[PDB]
Amino acid sequence: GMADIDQASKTEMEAAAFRHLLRHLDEHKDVQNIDLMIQADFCRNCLAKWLMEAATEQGVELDYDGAREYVYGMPFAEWKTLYQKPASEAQLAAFEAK
Amino acid sequence: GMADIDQASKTEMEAAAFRHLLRHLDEHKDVQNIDLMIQADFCRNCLAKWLMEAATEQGVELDYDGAREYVYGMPFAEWKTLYQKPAS
Ligand SMILES: [Ca+2]
Ligand SMILES: [Ca+2]
Ligand SMILES: [Cl-]
Ligand SMILES: [Cl-]
Ligand SMILES: [Cl-]
Known part of the structure; x- marks a missing residue:
């Protein structure tokens, strides 16, 4: 498991997985930040933060x-x-709801 | 910007941001994988893959x-x- 992997490799893997997420979001530009916020409480701007x-x-x-x-x-x-x-209006309301 | 940061720091930052997202999702166990698939086209299983x-x-x-x-x-x-x- 992860516990068995050397720290340098783990860091590279976590970094690689993050870059993969950035490509994924870039490939889904139709996926809106406000919907990410409503559904999942984070969006592209949070990743930047x-x-x-x-x-x-x-x-x-x-x-x-x-x-x-x-x-x-x-x-x-x-x-x-x-x-x-x-x-x-529905997204604003749903954001205000959560 | 990011292209100005030494490669080891940049790697560490990307890894840190990935671990932050894991903690974030763990803090939102209410957020089902189906909703992530619907709204974002990925979920926790994707991150594992x-x-x-x-x-x-x-x-x-x-x-x-x-x-x-x-x-x-x-x-x-x-x-x-x-x-x-x-x-x-
Ligand atoms: Ca990108
Ligand atoms: Ca965790
Ligand atoms: Cl957006
Ligand atoms: Cl935005
Ligand atoms: Cl789930």
């Missing part, structure tokens, strides 16, 4: 724009223009 | 039950009996 937190743990610098640019594969502003639809 | 694929990349064995035990924080059988509900 979590990277910034990890940057602090590693003594390195990453700001939110840089983190988002990495997560989205381009500047957030461009992603928003090209791909994002604003929330529906 | 991706970890299996990453193990192969690293020249180590991690089988599916091993991967799921890690992702879920306990054997999947036990998780299914305690947390999984039939789909409405």
Whole structure:
């Protein structure tokens, strides 16, 4: 199991799995952040925030724009223009519900 | 940005963010795998499969039950009996 694997390999595997998640989300641009928030309490923006937190743990610098640019594969502003639809009344309500 | 960070730190950050997502999902055991499949096209089993694929990349064995035990924080059988509900 995981307990049996050397730390360096485990870190590489967890890193690889994270990058896989980024590709998956990039391949499903129809999957909206507000729906991720409603269903699962996280979205692409949270992954960017979590990277910034990890940057602090590693003594390195990453700001939110840089983190988002990495997560989205381009500047957030461009992603928003090209791909994002604003929330529906039902999504706002359902977000307000949770 | 991310391209400016040394490779070892960047790897550590990606791994940390993956472990954060695991803790997040463990904190939301209410969030069923079906809803994740519906809304996001992946679920906890997917994360475990991706970890299996990453193990192969690293020249180590991690089988599916091993991967799921890690992702879920306990054997999947036990998780299914305690947390999984039939789909409405
Ligand atoms: Ca990407
Ligand atoms: Ca866990
Ligand atoms: Cl979105
Ligand atoms: Cl957003
Ligand atoms: Cl489930």
